[PDB]
Amino acid sequence: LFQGPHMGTSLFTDRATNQLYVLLSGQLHPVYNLTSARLVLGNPANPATVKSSELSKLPMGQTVGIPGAPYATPVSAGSTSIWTLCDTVARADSTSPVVQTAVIAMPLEIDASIDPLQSHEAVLVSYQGETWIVTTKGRHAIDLTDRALTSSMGIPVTARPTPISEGMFNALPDMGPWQLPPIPAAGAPNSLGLPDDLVIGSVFQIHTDKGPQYYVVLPDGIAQVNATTAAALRATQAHGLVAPPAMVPSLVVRIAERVYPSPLPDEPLKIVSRPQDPALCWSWQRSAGDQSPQSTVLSGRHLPISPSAMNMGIKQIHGTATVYLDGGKFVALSMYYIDPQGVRYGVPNAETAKSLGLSSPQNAPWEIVRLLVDGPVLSKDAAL
């Protein structure tokens, strides 16, 4: 297993300056950081003390190293790899609503105030002039200028979009527009042996035990739709019917049954109020047990971490996000070392990793890692 430090004879540290020195080909070169020293030595050496006196006997050389590299490369105890991206919108009713972004690589604290979006819940979002609807699935294009459509899909006029960050926009998969699947032959007489009333695109119902079951009339059969979709269909075009005509179950039992893929949920749509729930998250995890990654959209009152973690947030100067980390990470998207201040440094190959004493990198999503400030590549070629 070989855990712990490397003990060599080529790396030294002064008593007063705490400056590092690396012994290269008999000549003592100085080095910016412990990270760079290990790059050139080819081993994760731990420095040995030495009073300035002994440094004098040996001659000095040109300084080597990577000034922008992290000092060392510590990693926390994981194991687990949970990566979460969060948008928090400040003053959502304002003029002037504003979004801030958090990157989180630590266990989450999920509760009723901040938890996954439920199936019937959705967030209206604005990005570069266009509006989108965010659900458990991802983001769907939606035209909020079109009140006829919005009213038909159950989106109230009180509903307002809030800005989503570029990072969160890119992290959310595109699920296609928020619309009812087209029925181009709609309004045309049916060919199923149904009454002439029930034209293609019309909605009927069968009265069962556990409440009515709605059906849309399609060219090649009848398709089951939920109440939401039935209401949606009829709101855009009812084809002259005050209500969906009732069907005796014996009349449709030999009609072909088809699927109508409405994105509308069973329960009535609930558009979340951003001033009430300003946080919108995309959370990703993939336990080392091989598998496939698992991602989920969260919505809530604040970040899904303990209140004590809130004081640990580091906002990078060269960056967009506040980063919440419980120690350094070694990840594979192509490998990166990520320091506790949330800077990513490229690790080009496995021998460079071995030199640094980094091993067993965790899988992590590029969608989140790329948002971290990009530091210099950790390479011996540049360490020299």
Binding site for Ca ion (CB under 5 A): 113, 115
Cβ 280 to Ca ion shortest distance, Å: 11
Count of residues making up the chain: 384
Q: How far is residue 290's CA from residue 138's CA, in Å, rounded to a whole number?
A: 24
- Shortest distance, position 114 Cβ to Ca ion, whole Å: 6
The residue assigned the tokens 């430090």 is 5
| Residue 235 vs 312, nearer CB to Ca ion | 312
* Other C-beta atoms lying within 10 Å of the C-beta of residue 214: 21
Q: Shortest Cβ distance from residue 270 to Ca ion (Å)?
A: 10
Q: How many CB atoms lie within 10 A of CB 6?
A: 15
Q: How far is the CB of 165 from Ca ion (least distance, A)?
A: 21
**Minimum distance from residue 299 beta carbon to Ca ion (Å):** 6
**Least distance from C-beta 352 to Ca ion, angstroms?**
42
Q: How far is the CB of 277 from Ca ion (least distance, A)?
A: 7
Pairing of strands 213-218, 335-338: unpaired
Residue 138 burial (C-beta neighbours within 10 Å; 0-12, 13-18, 19+): middle
Please identify the residue of the shown chain whose CB is closest to the bound Ca ion: 113
Instruction: Find out whether 105 and 118 touch, Cβ atoms under 8 Å.
Output: no
Q: What minimum distance in Å lies between the beta carbon of 263 and Ca ion?
A: 20
Q: Which helix (H) or strand (E) element contains residue 234?
A: helix 227-236
* 222 φ, ψ (degrees, to nearest 5): -110, 140
Q: Nearer Cβ to Ca ion, position 15 or 301?
A: 301
Q: Which of 279, 252, 296, 362 is nearest to 138 (CA)?
A: 296
Tell the burial category of 382 from Cβ atoms under 10 Å away from its Cβ (0-12, 13-18, 19+). middle
Tell the smallest beta-carbon distance from residue 117 to Ca ion (Å).
Answer: 7
Burial, 235: exposed, middle or buried (Cβ in 10 Å; 0-12, 13-18, 19+)?
middle
**List of residues 6+ apart from 356 with CB closer than 8 A:** 35, 38, 39, 44, 73, 337, 347, 378
Gaps after which residues in the chain, C–N over 2.5 Å? 333
What b/e string do you get for 354-370 counting C-beta neighbours within 10 Å, with b at 16 or more? ebbbbeebbbbbebbbe
Name the one residue in this structure whose structure tokens are 């640094």: 356
Nearest residue (CB) to Ca ion, 14 versus 115: 115
